[PDB]
C-alpha cells in the first residue's frame, strides 16, 4: 500500500517498488515482461528499482507493476500509470525557487561585503 | 503450506488402457499444477503444465484436467514406455510442493 516512488533524472527514469521489502521483485510493463536478460540494455532492474534509460514518452510510458518472486503477474492490484515527457538536462523549477536563488545570492554578496568591511577595521 | 497429495501410491492396469491419476491440493491452487513423469532410470520430464496445456515434445496421448483442488491426468492407451512414476507439483504459492506420486 506504500505508494510507488518514481524519480526522473535527465533521460533516465527510475521506478522503485517498496511494498515488498523481503524478496526479489519482478516488473511488468504494459503486460509485457520487462527487466532481465533481454536485447534492450536501457532497461535494468536491481533490488526494487527499475531503471529505464533513454525513456521515450510514446514508447515506454504506460501501466507498470511490480510483483515479488513467487507471485504471478495476473494477481496484481497496485498499478503505476506513468506517462512522462522526458528531455535531457530537464529540471522543473517554479517561480519561488528562482526567487529564493536570487535572494540568497544577494544575501551571500552582502554578507561577504559586510565581513570584509568588519575585517578591515 | 499447500500440501500436495495423491489418491493411491500405485495403480495396476493392462496395456492399451485409459487410466486416470488423481491429485489433490490442500488449498485451491487456481489450476497452477504441473505433471511430471519419473522414469525408473532416474530421468524425469515435464509432461503438462498449467491446467491441461501440453508441453512441446510430449506425445499427445497424455491428457490432463481438473480445477480447484482436485486434478486428474487421464493418459491414453498404455504403452510399455508409459510405465513410470507421475508427480503433480503446485505452482500457486511458494514453496512449490510436489506429491507422493503414482506407480504405473
Amino acid at each position, epitope marked *: 500500500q506504500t505508494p510507488y516512488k518514481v524519480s526522473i533524472s535527465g533521460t533516465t527514469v527510475i521506478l522503485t517498488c517498496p511494498q515488498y521489502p523481503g*524478496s*526479489e521483485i*519482478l516488473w*511488468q510493463h504494459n503486460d509485457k*515482461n520487462i527487466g*532481465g*536478460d533481454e536485447d534492450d540494455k536501457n532497461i535494468g532492474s*536491481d533490488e526494487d528499482h527499475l531503471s529505464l534509460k533513454e525513456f521515450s514518452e510514446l514508447e515506454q510510458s504506460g501501466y507498470y507493476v511490480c*510483483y515479488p*518472486r*513467487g*507471485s*504471478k*503477474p*495476473e494477481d496484481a492490484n497496485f498499478y503505476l500509470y506513468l506517462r512522462a515527457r522526458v528531455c535531457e538536462n530537464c529540471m522543473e523549477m517554479d517561480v519561488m525557487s528562482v526567487a529564493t536563488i536570487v535572494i540568497v545570492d544577494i544575501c551571500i554578496t552582502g554578507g561577504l561585503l559586510l565581513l570584509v568591511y568588519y575585517w578591515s577595521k | 503450506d499447500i500440501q500436495m497429495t495423491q489418491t493411491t501410491s500405485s495403480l495396476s492396469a493392462s496395456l492399451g488402457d485409459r487410466v486416470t491419476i488423481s491429485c489433490r491440493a490442500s488449498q485451491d491452487i487456481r489450476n*497452477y499444477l*504441473n505433471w*511430471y513423469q*519419473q522414469k525408473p532410470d*532416474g*530421468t*524425469v*520430464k*515435464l509432461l503438462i*503444465y*498449467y491446467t491441461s496445456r501440453l*508441453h512441446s515434445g510430449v506425445p499427445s496421448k497424455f491428457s490432463g484436467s481438473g480445477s480447484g483442488t482436485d486434478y486428474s491426468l487421464t493418459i491414453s492407451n498404455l504403452e510399455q514406455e508409459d510405465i513410470a*512414476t507421475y*508427480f503433480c*507439483q503446485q*505452482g500457486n504459492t*511458494l*514453496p*512449490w*510442493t*510436489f506429491a*507422493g*506420486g503414482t506407480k504405473l
Partner: nanobody, 121 residues
Framework: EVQLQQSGPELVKPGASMKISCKAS????????MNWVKQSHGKNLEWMGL????????TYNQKFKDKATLTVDKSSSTAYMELLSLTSEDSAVYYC???????????????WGQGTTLTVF
C-alpha cells in the same frame, strides 16, 4: 538439444560440505531461472530453492534456507549448490530444474537434470 548435466555421487562424511554442479548447454544460461529439487525418503520430491542466474538473487524454501546456498557461474553456464553440515537426512538425489525467468512461467520446470546421488556416511 537443451540439457543439464550434473556431477557424480560424491560420497561425503557427516558434518562436511559438498558442492553440486549443474552444467547447462544448448541455450542462453542467464535467461532461465534454475531451481534445485531434492528427492529423499525413497522418492519424495521437495523443492529447495531457486537462483536467478542472471542476477545471483536466490529465493529459499524456509525448510532448507539453512541447509543449502546457491551460487551461479555465468562464465561456464554452470549452477552450483553448497550443502553445509550434511547429516544422514541429507542423503538423497539432487536435481537441478530449469524454469522460466519471469513470474508467468517460473513455476514449471521444463528441463531436469539426471540427478546427483549424494550419500552421507
Amino acid at each position: 538439444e537443451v540439457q543439464l548435466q550434473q556431477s557424480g555421487p560424491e560420497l561425503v562424511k557427516p558434518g562436511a560440505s559438498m558442492k553440486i554442479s549443474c552444467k547447462a548447454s544448448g541455450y542462453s544460461f542467464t535467461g532461465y531461472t534454475m531451481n534445485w529439487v531434492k528427492q529423499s525418503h525413497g522418492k519424495n520430491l521437495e523443492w529447495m530453492g531457486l537462483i536467478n542466474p542472471y542476477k545471483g538473487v536466490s529465493t529459499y524454501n524456509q525448510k532448507f534456507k539453512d541447509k543449502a546456498t546457491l551460487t551461479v557461474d555465468k562464465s561456464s553456464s554452470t549452477a552450483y549448490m553448497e550443502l553445509l553440515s550434511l547429516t544422514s537426512e541429507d542423503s538423497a538425489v539432487y536435481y537441478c530444474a530449469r524454469s522460466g525467468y519471469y513470474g508467468d512461467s517460473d513455476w514449471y520446470f521444463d528441463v531436469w537434470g539426471q540427478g546427483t546421488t549424494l550419500t552421507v556416511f
